[PDB]
Design a protein around this ligand. Structure first.
Ligand SMILES: *[C@@H]1O[C@H](CO)[C@@H](O)[C@H](O)[C@H]1NC(C)=O
Ligand SMILES: *[C@@H]1O[C@H](CO)[C@@H](O)[C@H](O)[C@H]1NC(C)=O
Ligand SMILES: *[C@@H]1O[C@H](CO)[C@@H](O)[C@H](O)[C@H]1NC(C)=O
Ligand SMILES: OC[C@H]1O[C@@H](O)[C@H](F)[C@@H](O)[C@@H]1O
Ligand SMILES: OC[C@H]1O[C@H](O)[C@H](F)[C@@H](O)[C@@H]1O
Length: 606
């Protein structure tokens, strides 16, 4: 279809499948394995991208061009890498991925949304769609086309360090929140065939259902460990949301570090090829996790040859190396040249990768749009995160006896109030992990509103707001306070660092609650990624709110404290009485919760 130097794969009017086949039929082995290789920006250069025909780049947690970088600095970095890839013989654009898992969260000034557990408390899949939408805009603001989200793990033990990344211990809630997918990628058209990848265009991003499969089912919640459960329970608990994801066109699927009955997911052909691809009819690409093929062996990385063989034969398409690309490429080349991995396997991987790239428009818009930069941190997105933060809150107690005046909602006018605790004025703590750094961080790490700031923005001008982080009991009794808001809880964590067998909050936490509440009527705001031992905090407190990890918009918290909106959130997980009970889920026989799944007190707006 027309000029003398026409190449069908470069013709935007042709069907994706015809373009895929046209390009694939031209490619060398090197160009093919290149597509299959994803590297960290930290190791990427223009020569490395060109010479190794690299298919993808990522930023892992905290992998940024510099601290504080602007949206434009990110666009320019990504476009630099693209320009190198576009200069190869075939000019195949790279796809750049990132963990945008509660907003565009590695980026300074990005809207930071509540983490997933809190979103589950909302029971509002439309709200989660809208968060998808806004996250896609903020990702494309930085020139990035691919988000490693949603995590559709079904966390079955809150001792897991990634429990906050699971919407619920109930798979039906997880299923309902796969609406993140069409928010990120766009709605699929009415005809659509379940399992096909989809992205609407340059203002949307490819998504990633992760981590396949049973990541939330591991023994004692140990991260990346073994999930022991028969097929029927794998398929009833851990798998269903993957089928919802196929029905909504999710473009990619990332594999878990975890094992199922002792078989590493990254080496599981039966599940990745037999089930995901051949039964669910998934046609997008399957990506490993970070050195996930290295971790097939024990010790990790002790037979990289076998890691390559086992993963690629299992059905993985794209490998998140992410650093030792030269070794990956050489090993896989040798396996193909030796007949150990057939060309049909390579060609299937490359067909899928290319399918997603063409489908999403990447050959038509390889470069960033500078007019999108101003989407970062936009107020309309902050307003959405604020609504989500408010909706996520679960009111656990609102009075010590059933005859007390309900403490919440608090009045905005009072002569003097106290805001206290390690989490009252600490933006990093209220965002949790995967915020600016991989592990998150402490303090004013990004743009946002702390609980303290939100208080001061909410109250009547005559109300004097005193902050003390850790006041003693005399300070409070002498202070002339009408009431106090005290916020305490978990520190940021991510992945295996967050695995915790005791689930007791760090001190001082309880001691400040006790000191404050012993002097004046108090509302305690508990910031956590999961249920934690709570009976001592409850016994001290007039009211207590589970606020989860509500993100940058701390005014969502005070919107409910001061009665601008009623409390509506409901527990999306079981609250245990003791960690010796665990695992314990809505359903077992020994089901003896402190608060059952679905519990939450309400208030009315004033
Ligand atoms: C689970 O963790 C244990 C104890 O740390 C370790 O020895 C074992 O290899 C892990 N198993 C898997 C399958 O990851
Ligand atoms: C419980 O576990 C955590 C994290 O693994 C540890 O840091 C903490 O000190 C423990 N708490 C107690 C009271 O032993
Ligand atoms: C809130 O409004 C509901 C719905 O009408 C009402 O029945 C409930 O008891 C109210 N509670 C308070 C404290 O106003
Ligand atoms: O374990 C080290 C690395 O692990 C990944 O899961 C993160 F995304 C990285 O940025 C991090 O530094
Ligand atoms: O950081 C890149 C990836 O590293 C591995 C993690 F388990 C996964 O959730 C993440 O998306």
């Amino acid at each position: 279809h027309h000029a003398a130097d026409y190449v069908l794969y470069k013709d935007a009017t042709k069907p994706v499948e015809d373009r895929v086949a046209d390009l694939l039929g031209r490619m060398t082995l090197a160009e093919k394995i290149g597509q299959m290789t994803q590297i960290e920006r930290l190791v990427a250069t223009p020569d490395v991208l060109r010479d190794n025909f690299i298919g993808s780049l990522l930023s892992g947690g905290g992998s940024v061009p510099r601290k504080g970088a602007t949206a434009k600095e990110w666009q320019d970095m990504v476009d630099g890498f693209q320009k190198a890839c576009m200069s190869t013989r075939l000019g195949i654009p790279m796809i750049y991925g990132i963990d945008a898992v509660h907003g565009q969260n590695n980026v300074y000034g990005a809207t930071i949304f509540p983490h997933n557990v809190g979103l589950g408390a909302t029971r509002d899949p439309y709200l989660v769609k809208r968060i998808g939408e806004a996250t896609a805009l903020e990702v494309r603001a930085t020139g990035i086309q691919y988000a490693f989200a949603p995590c559709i793990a079904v966390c079955r033990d809150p001792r897991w360090g990634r429990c906050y990344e699971s919407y619920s211990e109930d798979r039906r809630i997880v299923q309902s929140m796969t609406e993140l997918i069409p928010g990120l990628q766009g709605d699929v058209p009415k005809d659509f065939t379940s399992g096909m990848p989809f992205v609407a265009g340059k203002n949307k991003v490819a998504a990633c259902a992760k981590h396949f499969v049973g990541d939330g089912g591991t023994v004692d919640g140990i991260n990346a460990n073994n999930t022991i459960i028969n097929r029927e329970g794998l398929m009833n608990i851990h798998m269903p949301a993957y089928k919802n994801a196929m029905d909504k066109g999710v473009s990619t699927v990332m594999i878990s570090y975890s094992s199922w009955n002792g078989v590493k997911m990254h080496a599981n052909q039966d599940l990745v090829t037999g089930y995901l691809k051949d039964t669910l009819k998934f046609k997008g690409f399957v990506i490993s996790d970070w050195e996930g093929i290295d971790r097939i062996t024990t010790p990790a990385g002790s037979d990289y040859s076998y890691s390559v063989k086992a993963s690629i034969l299992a059905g993985l398409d794209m490998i998140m190396v992410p650093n030792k690309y030269q070794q990956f490429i050489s090993i896989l080349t040798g396996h193909v040249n030796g007949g150990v991995i057939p060309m049909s396997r390579i060609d299937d991987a490359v067909t899928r990768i290319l399918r997603v790239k063409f489908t999403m428009g990447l050959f038509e818009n390889p470069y960033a749009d500078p007019a999108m930069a101003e989407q970062l941190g936009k107020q309309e997105h902050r307003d959405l995160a604020r609504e989500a933060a408010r909706k996520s809150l679960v009111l656990l107690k609102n009075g010590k006896t059933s005859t007390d005046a309900p403490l919440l909602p608090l009045p905005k006018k009072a002569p003097k109030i106290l805001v206290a605790g390690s989490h009252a004025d600490n933006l990093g703590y209220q965002c949790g992990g995967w915020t600016i750094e991989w592990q998150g961080d402490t303090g004013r790490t990004t743009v946002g509103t702390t609980i303290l700031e939100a208080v001061k923005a909410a109250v009547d001008p005559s109300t004097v707001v005193v902050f003390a982080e850790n006041p003693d009991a005399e300070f409070v009794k002498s202070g002339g306070f009408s009431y106090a808001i005290v916020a305490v809880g978990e520190h940021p964590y991510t992945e295996t660092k967050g695995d915790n067998l005791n689930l007791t909050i760090p001190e001082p936490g309880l001691s400040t609650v006790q000191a404050v509440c012993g002097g004046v009527r108090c509302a305690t705001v508990l910031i956590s990624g999961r249920p934690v031992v709570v009976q001592p905090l409850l016994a001290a407190s007039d009211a207590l709110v589970a606020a989860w990890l509500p993100g940058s918009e701390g005014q969502g918290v005070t919107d409910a404290l001061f009665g601008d909106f009623g409390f509506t959130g409901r527990l999306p997980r079981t609250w245990f009485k003791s960690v010796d009970q665990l695992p314990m889920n809505v359903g077992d026989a020994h089901y003896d919760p402190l608060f059952r799944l679905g519990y939450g007190l309400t208030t009315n707006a004033t």
